Amino acid sequence: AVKKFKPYTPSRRFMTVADFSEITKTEPEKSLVKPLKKTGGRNNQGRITVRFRGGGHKRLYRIIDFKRWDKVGIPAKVAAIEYDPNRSARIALLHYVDGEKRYIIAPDGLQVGQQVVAGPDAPIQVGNALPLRFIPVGTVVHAVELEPKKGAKLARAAGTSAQIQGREGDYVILRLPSGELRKVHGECYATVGAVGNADHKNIVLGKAGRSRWLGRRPHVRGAAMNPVDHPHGGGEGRAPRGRPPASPWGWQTKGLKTRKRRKPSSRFIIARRKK
Amino acid sequence: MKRTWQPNRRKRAKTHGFRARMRTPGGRKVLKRRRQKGRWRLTPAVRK
RNA sequence: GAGCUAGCCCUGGCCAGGGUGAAGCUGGGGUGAGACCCAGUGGAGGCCCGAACCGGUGGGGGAUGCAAACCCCUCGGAUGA
RNA sequence: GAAUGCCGGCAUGAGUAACGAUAAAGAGGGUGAGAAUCCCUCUCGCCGUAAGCCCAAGGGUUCCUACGCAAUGGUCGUCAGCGUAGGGUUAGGCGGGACCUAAGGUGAAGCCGAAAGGCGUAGCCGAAGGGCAGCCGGUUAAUAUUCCGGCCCUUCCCGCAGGUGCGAUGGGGGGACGCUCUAGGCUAGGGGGACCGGAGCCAUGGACGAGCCCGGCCAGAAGCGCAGGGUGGGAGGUAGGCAAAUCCGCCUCCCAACAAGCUCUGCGUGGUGGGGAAGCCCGGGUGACAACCCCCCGAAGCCAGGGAGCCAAGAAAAGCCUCUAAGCACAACCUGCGGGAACCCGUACCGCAAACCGACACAGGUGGGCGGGUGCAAGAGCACUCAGGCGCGCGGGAGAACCCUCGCCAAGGAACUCUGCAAGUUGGCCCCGUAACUUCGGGAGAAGGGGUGCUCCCUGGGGUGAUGAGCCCCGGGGAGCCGCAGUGAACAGGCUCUGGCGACUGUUUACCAAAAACACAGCUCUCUGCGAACUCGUAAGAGGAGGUAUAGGGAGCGACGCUUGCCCGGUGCCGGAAGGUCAAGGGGAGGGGUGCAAGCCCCGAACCGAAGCCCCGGUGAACGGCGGCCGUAACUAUAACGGUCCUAAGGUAGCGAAAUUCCUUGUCGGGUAAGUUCCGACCUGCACGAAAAGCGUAACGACCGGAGCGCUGUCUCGGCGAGGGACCCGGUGAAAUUGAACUGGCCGUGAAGAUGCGGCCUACCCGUGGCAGGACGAAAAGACCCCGUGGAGCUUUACUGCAGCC
RNA sequence: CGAUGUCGGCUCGUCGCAUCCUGGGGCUGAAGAAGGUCCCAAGGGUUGGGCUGUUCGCCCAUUAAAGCGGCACGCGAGCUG
RNA sequence: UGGGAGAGGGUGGUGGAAUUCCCGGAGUAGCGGUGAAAUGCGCAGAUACCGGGAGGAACGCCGAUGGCGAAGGCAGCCACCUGGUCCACCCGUGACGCUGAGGCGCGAAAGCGUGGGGAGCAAACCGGAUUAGAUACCCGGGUAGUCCACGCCCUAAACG
RNA sequence: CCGAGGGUAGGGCCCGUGACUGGGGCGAAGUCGUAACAAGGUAGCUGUACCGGAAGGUGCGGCUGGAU
Ligand SMILES: [Mg+2]
Ligand SMILES: [Mg+2]
Ligand SMILES: [Mg+2]
Ligand SMILES: [Mg+2]
Ligand SMILES: [Mg+2]
Ligand SMILES: [Mg+2]
Ligand SMILES: [Mg+2]
Ligand SMILES: [Mg+2]
Ligand SMILES: [Mg+2]
Ligand SMILES: [Mg+2]
Ligand SMILES: [Mg+2]
Ligand SMILES: [Mg+2]
Ligand SMILES: [Mg+2]
Ligand SMILES: [Mg+2]
Ligand SMILES: [Mg+2]
Ligand SMILES: [Mg+2]
Ligand SMILES: [Mg+2]
Ligand SMILES: [Mg+2]
Ligand SMILES: [Mg+2]
Ligand SMILES: [Mg+2]
Ligand SMILES: [Mg+2]
Ligand SMILES: [Mg+2]
Ligand SMILES: [Mg+2]
Ligand SMILES: [Mg+2]
Ligand SMILES: [Mg+2]
Ligand SMILES: [Mg+2]
Ligand SMILES: [Mg+2]
Ligand SMILES: [Mg+2]
Ligand SMILES: [Mg+2]
Ligand SMILES: [Mg+2]
Ligand SMILES: [Mg+2]
Ligand SMILES: [Mg+2]
Ligand SMILES: [Mg+2]
Ligand SMILES: [Mg+2]
Ligand SMILES: [Mg+2]
Ligand SMILES: [Mg+2]
Ligand SMILES: [Mg+2]
Ligand SMILES: [Mg+2]
Ligand SMILES: [Mg+2]
Ligand SMILES: [Mg+2]
Ligand SMILES: [Mg+2]
Ligand SMILES: [Mg+2]
Ligand SMILES: [Mg+2]
Ligand SMILES: [Mg+2]
Ligand SMILES: [Mg+2]
Ligand SMILES: [Mg+2]
Ligand SMILES: [Mg+2]
Ligand SMILES: [Mg+2]
Ligand SMILES: [Mg+2]
Ligand SMILES: [Mg+2]
Ligand SMILES: [Mg+2]
Ligand SMILES: [Mg+2]
Ligand SMILES: [Mg+2]
Ligand SMILES: [Mg+2]
Ligand SMILES: [Mg+2]
Ligand SMILES: [Mg+2]
Ligand SMILES: [Mg+2]
Ligand SMILES: [Mg+2]
Ligand SMILES: [Mg+2]
Ligand SMILES: [Mg+2]
Ligand SMILES: [Mg+2]
Ligand SMILES: [Mg+2]
Ligand SMILES: [Mg+2]
Ligand SMILES: [Mg+2]
Ligand SMILES: [Mg+2]
Ligand SMILES: [Mg+2]
Ligand SMILES: [Mg+2]
Ligand SMILES: [Mg+2]
Ligand SMILES: [Mg+2]
Ligand SMILES: [Mg+2]
Ligand SMILES: [Mg+2]
Ligand SMILES: [Mg+2]
Ligand SMILES: [Mg+2]
Ligand SMILES: [Mg+2]
Ligand SMILES: [Mg+2]
Ligand SMILES: [Mg+2]
Ligand SMILES: [Mg+2]
Ligand SMILES: [Mg+2]
Ligand SMILES: [Mg+2]
Ligand SMILES: [Mg+2]
Ligand SMILES: [Mg+2]
Ligand SMILES: [Mg+2]
Ligand SMILES: [Mg+2]
Ligand SMILES: [Mg+2]
Ligand SMILES: [Mg+2]
Ligand SMILES: [Mg+2]
Ligand SMILES: [Mg+2]
Ligand SMILES: [Mg+2]
Ligand SMILES: [Mg+2]
Ligand SMILES: [Mg+2]
Ligand SMILES: [Mg+2]
Ligand SMILES: [Mg+2]
Ligand SMILES: [Mg+2]
Ligand SMILES: [Mg+2]
Ligand SMILES: [Mg+2]
Ligand SMILES: [Mg+2]
Ligand SMILES: [Mg+2]
Ligand SMILES: [Mg+2]
Ligand SMILES: [Mg+2]
Ligand SMILES: [Mg+2]
Ligand SMILES: [Mg+2]
Ligand SMILES: [Mg+2]
Ligand SMILES: [Mg+2]
Ligand SMILES: [Mg+2]
Ligand SMILES: [Mg+2]
Ligand SMILES: [Mg+2]
Ligand SMILES: [Mg+2]
Ligand SMILES: [Mg+2]
Ligand SMILES: [Mg+2]
Ligand SMILES: [Mg+2]
Ligand SMILES: [Mg+2]
Ligand SMILES: [Mg+2]
Ligand SMILES: [Mg+2]
Ligand SMILES: [Mg+2]
Ligand SMILES: [Mg+2]
Ligand SMILES: [Mg+2]
Ligand SMILES: [Mg+2]
Ligand SMILES: [Mg+2]
Ligand SMILES: [Mg+2]
Ligand SMILES: [Mg+2]
Ligand SMILES: [Mg+2]
Ligand SMILES: [Mg+2]
Ligand SMILES: [Mg+2]
Ligand SMILES: [Mg+2]
Ligand SMILES: [Mg+2]
Ligand SMILES: [Mg+2]
Ligand SMILES: [Mg+2]
Ligand SMILES: [Mg+2]
Ligand SMILES: [Mg+2]
Ligand SMILES: [Mg+2]
Ligand SMILES: [Mg+2]
Ligand SMILES: [Mg+2]
Ligand SMILES: [Mg+2]
Ligand SMILES: [Mg+2]
Ligand SMILES: [Mg+2]
Ligand SMILES: [Mg+2]
Ligand SMILES: [Mg+2]
Ligand SMILES: [Mg+2]
Ligand SMILES: [Mg+2]
Ligand SMILES: [Mg+2]
Ligand SMILES: [Mg+2]
Ligand SMILES: [Mg+2]
Ligand SMILES: [Mg+2]
Ligand SMILES: [Mg+2]
Ligand SMILES: [Mg+2]
Ligand SMILES: [Mg+2]
Ligand SMILES: [Mg+2]
Ligand SMILES: [Mg+2]
Ligand SMILES: [Mg+2]
Ligand SMILES: [Mg+2]
Ligand SMILES: [Mg+2]
Ligand SMILES: [Mg+2]
Ligand SMILES: [Mg+2]
Ligand SMILES: [Mg+2]
Ligand SMILES: [Mg+2]
Ligand SMILES: [Mg+2]
Ligand SMILES: [Mg+2]
Ligand SMILES: [Mg+2]
Ligand SMILES: [Mg+2]
Ligand SMILES: [Mg+2]
Ligand SMILES: [Mg+2]
Ligand SMILES: [Mg+2]
Ligand SMILES: [Mg+2]
Ligand SMILES: [Mg+2]
Ligand SMILES: [Mg+2]
Ligand SMILES: [Mg+2]
Ligand SMILES: [Mg+2]
Ligand SMILES: [Mg+2]
Ligand SMILES: [Mg+2]
Ligand SMILES: [Mg+2]
Ligand SMILES: [Mg+2]
Ligand SMILES: [Mg+2]
Ligand SMILES: [Mg+2]
Ligand SMILES: [Mg+2]
Ligand SMILES: [Mg+2]
Ligand SMILES: [Mg+2]
Ligand SMILES: [Mg+2]
Ligand SMILES: [Mg+2]
Ligand SMILES: [Mg+2]
Ligand SMILES: [Mg+2]
Ligand SMILES: [Mg+2]
Ligand SMILES: [Mg+2]
Ligand SMILES: [Mg+2]
Ligand SMILES: [Mg+2]
Ligand SMILES: [Mg+2]
Ligand SMILES: [Mg+2]
Ligand SMILES: [Mg+2]
Ligand SMILES: [Mg+2]
Ligand SMILES: [Mg+2]
Ligand SMILES: [Mg+2]
Ligand SMILES: [Mg+2]
Ligand SMILES: [Mg+2]
Ligand SMILES: [Mg+2]
Ligand SMILES: [Mg+2]
Ligand SMILES: [Mg+2]
Ligand SMILES: [Mg+2]
Ligand SMILES: [Mg+2]
Ligand SMILES: [Mg+2]
Ligand SMILES: [Mg+2]
Ligand SMILES: [Mg+2]
Ligand SMILES: [Mg+2]
Ligand SMILES: [Mg+2]
Ligand SMILES: [Mg+2]
Ligand SMILES: [Mg+2]
Ligand SMILES: [Mg+2]
Ligand SMILES: [Mg+2]
Ligand SMILES: [Mg+2]
Ligand SMILES: [Mg+2]
Ligand SMILES: [Mg+2]
Ligand SMILES: [Mg+2]
Ligand SMILES: [Mg+2]
Ligand SMILES: [Mg+2]
Ligand SMILES: [Mg+2]
Ligand SMILES: [Mg+2]
Ligand SMILES: [Mg+2]
Ligand SMILES: [Mg+2]
Ligand SMILES: [Mg+2]
Ligand SMILES: [Mg+2]
Ligand SMILES: [Mg+2]
Ligand SMILES: [Mg+2]
Ligand SMILES: [Mg+2]
Ligand SMILES: [Mg+2]
Ligand SMILES: [Mg+2]
Ligand SMILES: [Mg+2]
Ligand SMILES: [Mg+2]
Ligand SMILES: [Mg+2]
Ligand SMILES: [Mg+2]
Ligand SMILES: [Mg+2]
Ligand SMILES: [Mg+2]
Ligand SMILES: [Mg+2]
Ligand SMILES: [Mg+2]
Ligand SMILES: [Mg+2]
Ligand SMILES: [Mg+2]
Ligand SMILES: [Mg+2]
Ligand SMILES: [Mg+2]
Ligand SMILES: [Mg+2]
Ligand SMILES: [Mg+2]
Ligand SMILES: [Mg+2]
Ligand SMILES: [Mg+2]
Ligand SMILES: [Mg+2]
Ligand SMILES: [Mg+2]
Ligand SMILES: [Mg+2]
Ligand SMILES: [Mg+2]
Ligand SMILES: [Mg+2]
Ligand SMILES: [Mg+2]
Ligand SMILES: [Mg+2]
Ligand SMILES: [Mg+2]
Ligand SMILES: [Mg+2]
Ligand SMILES: [Mg+2]
Ligand SMILES: [Mg+2]
Ligand SMILES: [Mg+2]
Ligand SMILES: [Mg+2]
Ligand SMILES: [Mg+2]
Ligand SMILES: [Mg+2]
Ligand SMILES: [Mg+2]
Ligand SMILES: [Mg+2]
Ligand SMILES: [Mg+2]
Ligand SMILES: [Mg+2]
Ligand SMILES: [Mg+2]
Ligand SMILES: [Mg+2]
Ligand SMILES: [Mg+2]
Ligand SMILES: [Mg+2]
Ligand SMILES: [Mg+2]
Ligand SMILES: [Mg+2]
Ligand SMILES: [Mg+2]
């Protein structure tokens, strides 16, 4: 869990890498991969719409099963646990007794060789998917649909989880990884357990180069530019912001809320995120 | 040093060529214009 | 108009030779079991020296130039952002 | 007659600068009207990881031959990439198309936009990626994997035989993949041979030799051999691969497993087809029945889709194989053999350059492969040299100043100067040895030394082979020889102490700044619940992201260490269903116009009425801010203490004459003979201070300071020498500039600095090499400065709008 | 202002004299030696370093002395920067 | 060998009381706080009362002058894993013992690193009083920390 | 060959001294406050943490060498 290096270069001092001790299979399932179109943060106009992106390692996209209500009742075996460079979590290879193979994202504690299954009758067991309606109150859960049959939307980053606080009517009450209290529909699926690779957040990139490998190009501060570029541009020598700190596009960036006020989901958010 | 003209027959025909001109409205008014003026060639000649 | 230049995308190519010697593994020692120590093996690194390649630090020359940015000596990077 | 006018023509500078890398020339013989310059020969020098050779791009006849020399060629020209004419580019296998997909482009369906048009699934296009059948020699003045010769191979059509449930744009398998390191066995290439073939050669003192010099191969179908890659067999069940399925996937059972077998490549061999040197003789002919063998080195290439490790986790589609469905089983497909069929485009030549990009036959720029030998530890480094290719399209003299590039220097050794700028010194390898400090890696090539050649003798280990010889590779010991000197030539660190800034490798103002700037891992704040926020777009649609709070946006800060205090009164943001204000709308007390009137028409109070603002709170790693005066201790001085005025609160730790200190070279101490700089301190900090972060910090730095050692032409202080220019001669022959000129000094005068006016002095006419004081010398209608109700970029609590959001 | 290059240094001088030294004097509160002050005099001479961009100034070691000013704050078609 | 008592230790689970906050209801002019007050909070609907929810920490009565441990120290309840210890029987070994410089391990609180977690409490800090002053005692707030995991620190009126 | 020692270079220990700086001891009658000894007028002592002109205060946990 997080390997360290001796300081035999200036960057190996702090650089840490994952232990990869859970991975059992070091090459992907040929039938479950497809090319990932690297965009560089450029839209169909060719315009950079998200700055500072590009230049990262080539990746194959692994098709992930975020429904699991496709195969209600059909058990699967845990065949392997694999690297996925498109997400922070690890992924899990399932050999269904159907003979079909799919990927899910690996919850914490899932062991290769285990049987998993999905549906209302399913056991409350790490890796099983049920509608939220049927999971006991108080159970930690992950990969949660936000609406019925629309696909797992919540709590899939490494180490994340959502806890079931209670239910009312057709809806259950979840505590999201952010701490928001939200009602989610009881028919929405979810997988009991928390996402694996919890130590993911304790990784120290160590040097600029690792950012470049992840497709992250250098980010240049506003205070470093000229007035034609940014509200914080200009000044003789260094300079404080000299105005409410702002984005490149004018708007304030220290506390200004930006959620849409009349958004129809407000009726289902019970409490705004903690901390 | 490296100068600005680096000829390229594919780049030339695809950028200034007859069919590139005919695709866009400003491309056609170019040909229209050069036809009106009596240009001997409406488009850069390139060997292919 | 991006055949210059800047960034990104797709697909290929290049990086003489030498130097240092991380993790791991093996054996030995150690202990209740360990941490750990030693030797061997090993060959990591925006590691070291240095051609190609990419640069342009100091000085001299050139200044109706060989050249609308060049030449000489010197110098930086050279498995990597 | 003037517009730095416009167009052209012709002058001046001037027979002046220059004639484009300092790799270099000399003679003889030809040709011709004419020759330093063209051809031939001999001698000399230059490149040789190229300055040689082969591809690609771009160029487009420049290629070959004949006949030419007006112009082009920096001179000449009989020559030429120039002029005229004729000739020259040959493919089923090479490259591209009749094949496939990548980004991207286009785009039936569909969506969007005043118009023009913008999107968009499939599909289509799109290559230097995937896929696919030709190798060796000969021939032409000029093409050749293209013609020819030899030996092989692919596809399509039709036929014959044998075989099988045949059949696809649908299902599946495969194609199919990174980085670093790397095994075995080969081949490319190379070194050697006392072996094999060769025309010869004996010089000048010696050698007739196990002498010198030259060469000792290339291609090849089946088969076979060595080395590899790939690959389990059978059965039963089956609900999954959007129909089917005997295929694939999943379960079970049996047998086989570092094998074997089958299959596919590489290398070797292989019938056979080629090639074949020096030297001599006129590209050729001979040599020659040429010989064509043995040993060693050996790839980064081959076997290959090999192996191991690691994280940043490494295209697609077709060919191909298999499964089947419609259909069809007179079929159709598979295998073997045979005949026939096989189209379009490129192919000349240059290609690190005189043919490409730079206006030039321009010291610049241009992607891929081959790139031999010896020595130097290695190598593509360096020196010389092979094959090959050149002497750079003005020359001949002379041997001044001065300039450039270079060599040396007595004594001194930084005294030079803003500065050791520059140039010395050091310099590779092996061995000995190596400090503070430190994040324990480092600092480190620290520093400082010793060794280095040749000869003879003794000897250890490895590779090949066989275990031995030979060859090759690492070494160990002893005795000697020579010189000033043994990395004897060439290539190859000067070192140390101490500050500032920045953690570091990186990045930048293409063309005056490479830095202390930008970036950067890391820290914090903040927004964002997913049709996310945010961004581009009128929109549709995209990016975000096929991601989901361990995630994505924004902002500041900038490894790490120890830390980051007090102020919420104002501005910002956040919270606040009350109150205050508030537009359109609602409401209609009450008025007005008009009509005979019913009516029509107009104004209009109270009152209801959002956001925003007011108001009440919160909030600093939000914008920001963090006092003044007077007095006081038993020497003096200074105030722990106190008084009072003000504030939203009065600067904490740490640091401080600093990249900040004005007075300032503050004062004291160190260093020096002497120190406005430097280092260490003090603290009245003009005008440090805590993420516009404060204080430190090992390592790192073409950053900027100060010192020391070493060593020097930097200097006292200059001298001599070399080559390339300058100078002279023949050839070719510019430029900016220019009112005209018959163009001296002084002292005055003048629009205030006179060759040109006055007075005086001096002065025969014309050049050449030189120096720069003047011609307010040239260049550019001053960038500074001001003026113009000139312009543009930028800012905000300037005005007024607009997008966007509410 | 259709341009008169702006500090200092180096190099190269040349002039003035209100003289720093050397030569000639008078007065002295000049015994001598050595000074002071003033007059005449521009022939010649007027050093090397540390600091700073510096001119200037201070300092070290000397000296007969270590002069002051002008020449576009002399001199960038002479150099530096 | 057969038995016993125990907050000895580690892991996971779980139970109710209370406090704070959130939502709903009902209700009104104060609540709070002290020596006395003020700050603070409350008509924008607090305090007091009822129902519901979230979360943390500590375990009332038993409880004792009690028990366990070498010491530090250990207290709801359940299970698992584990140490020490006492009694009985008189069964086995036959001095196998005592101590212990160095070594190693454990070691309250506070404190440190990286993640969490955060109800109450509370250094710092802010505010109200008191006072000549009040950088205190008292009151209203309040950040580290107190809690969990891993890793350090290794101190004590670590005392009988 | 060894060899007194000389020279070049780098280390280790000790002593003296140094602008300035840190606390310490001592000093007949200084300034500020009153922490401790009585419950010393907030029981004290304590290890540690943070803070403050100064003694000290406060948190956390500990000791009685704490009174009633
Ligand atoms: Mg690390
Ligand atoms: Mg370490
Ligand atoms: Mg893992
Ligand atoms: Mg696929
Ligand atoms: Mg994508
Ligand atoms: Mg598009
Ligand atoms: Mg477009
Ligand atoms: Mg963006
Ligand atoms: Mg981008
Ligand atoms: Mg992710
Ligand atoms: Mg993963
Ligand atoms: Mg829902
Ligand atoms: Mg992180
Ligand atoms: Mg990446
Ligand atoms: Mg980032
Ligand atoms: Mg940045
Ligand atoms: Mg800026
Ligand atoms: Mg800037
Ligand atoms: Mg712009
Ligand atoms: Mg603007
Ligand atoms: Mg702006
Ligand atoms: Mg600004
Ligand atoms: Mg600025
Ligand atoms: Mg400033
Ligand atoms: Mg700036
Ligand atoms: Mg700021
Ligand atoms: Mg400001
Ligand atoms: Mg702003
Ligand atoms: Mg917005
Ligand atoms: Mg929320
Ligand atoms: Mg360029
Ligand atoms: Mg051009
Ligand atoms: Mg180009
Ligand atoms: Mg082209
Ligand atoms: Mg092309
Ligand atoms: Mg092109
Ligand atoms: Mg186009
Ligand atoms: Mg076109
Ligand atoms: Mg049109
Ligand atoms: Mg039209
Ligand atoms: Mg034309
Ligand atoms: Mg025509
Ligand atoms: Mg055109
Ligand atoms: Mg290009
Ligand atoms: Mg390289
Ligand atoms: Mg070495
Ligand atoms: Mg290993
Ligand atoms: Mg490197
Ligand atoms: Mg090195
Ligand atoms: Mg360059
Ligand atoms: Mg240069
Ligand atoms: Mg130099
Ligand atoms: Mg120039
Ligand atoms: Mg050059
Ligand atoms: Mg050079
Ligand atoms: Mg170098
Ligand atoms: Mg290097
Ligand atoms: Mg290298
Ligand atoms: Mg006139
Ligand atoms: Mg004009
Ligand atoms: Mg004109
Ligand atoms: Mg003209
Ligand atoms: Mg004419
Ligand atoms: Mg003319
Ligand atoms: Mg003339
Ligand atoms: Mg002349
Ligand atoms: Mg000239
Ligand atoms: Mg020239
Ligand atoms: Mg040259
Ligand atoms: Mg040469
Ligand atoms: Mg000759
Ligand atoms: Mg000749
Ligand atoms: Mg003739
Ligand atoms: Mg000639
Ligand atoms: Mg001639
Ligand atoms: Mg010739
Ligand atoms: Mg060579
Ligand atoms: Mg051309
Ligand atoms: Mg001619
Ligand atoms: Mg001629
Ligand atoms: Mg003619
Ligand atoms: Mg000519
Ligand atoms: Mg020419
Ligand atoms: Mg031809
Ligand atoms: Mg052919
Ligand atoms: Mg056809
Ligand atoms: Mg296609
Ligand atoms: Mg259209
Ligand atoms: Mg196309
Ligand atoms: Mg195509
Ligand atoms: Mg192709
Ligand atoms: Mg590929
Ligand atoms: Mg082909
Ligand atoms: Mg062949
Ligand atoms: Mg041939
Ligand atoms: Mg098929
Ligand atoms: Mg594959
Ligand atoms: Mg793949
Ligand atoms: Mg990698
Ligand atoms: Mg071969
Ligand atoms: Mg060899
Ligand atoms: Mg089936
Ligand atoms: Mg192959
Ligand atoms: Mg013959
Ligand atoms: Mg290679
Ligand atoms: Mg391969
Ligand atoms: Mg595709
Ligand atoms: Mg039939
Ligand atoms: Mg068959
Ligand atoms: Mg055709
Ligand atoms: Mg050809
Ligand atoms: Mg060629
Ligand atoms: Mg070149
Ligand atoms: Mg090339
Ligand atoms: Mg040529
Ligand atoms: Mg040019
Ligand atoms: Mg030439
Ligand atoms: Mg050229
Ligand atoms: Mg090149
Ligand atoms: Mg050879
Ligand atoms: Mg070498
Ligand atoms: Mg020449
Ligand atoms: Mg040349
Ligand atoms: Mg020439
Ligand atoms: Mg001469
Ligand atoms: Mg030269
Ligand atoms: Mg020499
Ligand atoms: Mg000599
Ligand atoms: Mg000398
Ligand atoms: Mg010296
Ligand atoms: Mg010396
Ligand atoms: Mg010096
Ligand atoms: Mg000098
Ligand atoms: Mg300088
Ligand atoms: Mg040297
Ligand atoms: Mg050297
Ligand atoms: Mg030292
Ligand atoms: Mg040092
Ligand atoms: Mg240090
Ligand atoms: Mg160390
Ligand atoms: Mg060494
Ligand atoms: Mg050395
Ligand atoms: Mg020796
Ligand atoms: Mg010799
Ligand atoms: Mg070096
Ligand atoms: Mg830096
Ligand atoms: Mg920087
Ligand atoms: Mg710093
Ligand atoms: Mg730092
Ligand atoms: Mg680098
Ligand atoms: Mg620049
Ligand atoms: Mg510039
Ligand atoms: Mg420029
Ligand atoms: Mg420059
Ligand atoms: Mg700069
Ligand atoms: Mg640099
Ligand atoms: Mg920058
Ligand atoms: Mg940095
Ligand atoms: Mg940080
Ligand atoms: Mg954070
Ligand atoms: Mg926009
Ligand atoms: Mg997407
Ligand atoms: Mg940094
Ligand atoms: Mg930065
Ligand atoms: Mg430290
Ligand atoms: Mg405030
Ligand atoms: Mg406030
Ligand atoms: Mg405020
Ligand atoms: Mg109204
Ligand atoms: Mg302000
Ligand atoms: Mg303010
Ligand atoms: Mg007094
Ligand atoms: Mg304070
Ligand atoms: Mg503090
Ligand atoms: Mg100071
Ligand atoms: Mg000072
Ligand atoms: Mg400072
Ligand atoms: Mg400064
Ligand atoms: Mg300051
Ligand atoms: Mg100062
Ligand atoms: Mg000053
Ligand atoms: Mg001084
Ligand atoms: Mg001193
Ligand atoms: Mg002072
Ligand atoms: Mg500052
Ligand atoms: Mg600042
Ligand atoms: Mg430092
Ligand atoms: Mg340092
Ligand atoms: Mg650097
Ligand atoms: Mg630097
Ligand atoms: Mg210096
Ligand atoms: Mg020095
Ligand atoms: Mg000289
Ligand atoms: Mg000469
Ligand atoms: Mg002539
Ligand atoms: Mg001519
Ligand atoms: Mg005249
Ligand atoms: Mg005249
Ligand atoms: Mg005259
Ligand atoms: Mg005259
Ligand atoms: Mg006047
Ligand atoms: Mg005059
Ligand atoms: Mg005159
Ligand atoms: Mg006149
Ligand atoms: Mg007159
Ligand atoms: Mg006159
Ligand atoms: Mg006159
Ligand atoms: Mg005269
Ligand atoms: Mg002359
Ligand atoms: Mg002359
Ligand atoms: Mg002159
Ligand atoms: Mg001049
Ligand atoms: Mg003049
Ligand atoms: Mg004038
Ligand atoms: Mg002048
Ligand atoms: Mg002049
Ligand atoms: Mg004008
Ligand atoms: Mg003007
Ligand atoms: Mg101008
Ligand atoms: Mg300017
Ligand atoms: Mg200006
Ligand atoms: Mg003015
Ligand atoms: Mg005005
Ligand atoms: Mg006016
Ligand atoms: Mg104006
Ligand atoms: Mg002017
Ligand atoms: Mg003019
Ligand atoms: Mg002018
Ligand atoms: Mg006298
Ligand atoms: Mg006397
Ligand atoms: Mg006397
Ligand atoms: Mg007198
Ligand atoms: Mg005189
Ligand atoms: Mg001075
Ligand atoms: Mg001056
Ligand atoms: Mg001064
Ligand atoms: Mg005297
Ligand atoms: Mg003067
Ligand atoms: Mg004057
Ligand atoms: Mg002047
Ligand atoms: Mg003046
Ligand atoms: Mg002046
Ligand atoms: Mg002057
Ligand atoms: Mg100048
Ligand atoms: Mg000057
Ligand atoms: Mg001038
Ligand atoms: Mg300057
Ligand atoms: Mg300069
Ligand atoms: Mg009230
Ligand atoms: Mg009310
Ligand atoms: Mg909570
Ligand atoms: Mg239980
Ligand atoms: Mg017994
Ligand atoms: Mg004991
Ligand atoms: Mg504790
Ligand atoms: Mg108060
Ligand atoms: Mg009072
Ligand atoms: Mg402890
Ligand atoms: Mg006790
Ligand atoms: Mg001696
Ligand atoms: Mg007390
Ligand atoms: Mg008391
Ligand atoms: Mg008291
Ligand atoms: Mg007390
Ligand atoms: Mg306190």
Side-chain angles (χ1 to χ4, degrees), chain A residues 10-76:
Chain A
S11 313
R12 290 296 156 165
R13 317 207 48 124
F14 313 100
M15 194 171 315
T16 60
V17 302
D19 61 353
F20 303 145
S21 278
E22 297 287 332
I23 296 171
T24 56
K25 182 186 172 291
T26 71
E27 205 61 39
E29 193 69 26
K30 189 179 175 176
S31 95
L32 289 179
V33 300
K34 60 186 208 182
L36 180 124
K37 176 53 204 148
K38 271 167 72 195
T39 84
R42 276 123 159 121
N43 74 334
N44 49 24
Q45 301 160 334
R47 299 284 191 90
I48 292 168
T49 57
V50 166
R51 309 180 291 152
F52 306 131
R53 274 180 198 254
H57 202 297
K58 186 163 182 173
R59 297 162 176 184
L60 265 46
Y61 176 77
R62 291 117 174 95
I63 299 159
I64 311 298
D65 173 29
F66 288 122
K67 298 181 164 188
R68 290 205 58 181
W69 47 256
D70 290 349
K71 308 199 75 55
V72 169
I74 312 175

Side-chain angles (χ1 to χ4, degrees), chain A residues 212-232:
Chain A
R212 298 311 298 282
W213 307 341
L214 296 167
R216 294 159 160 149
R217 303 195 40 243
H219 189 131
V220 28
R221 298 167 292 107
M225 318 173 159
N226 290 321
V228 272
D229 299 310
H230 196 285
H232 301 171

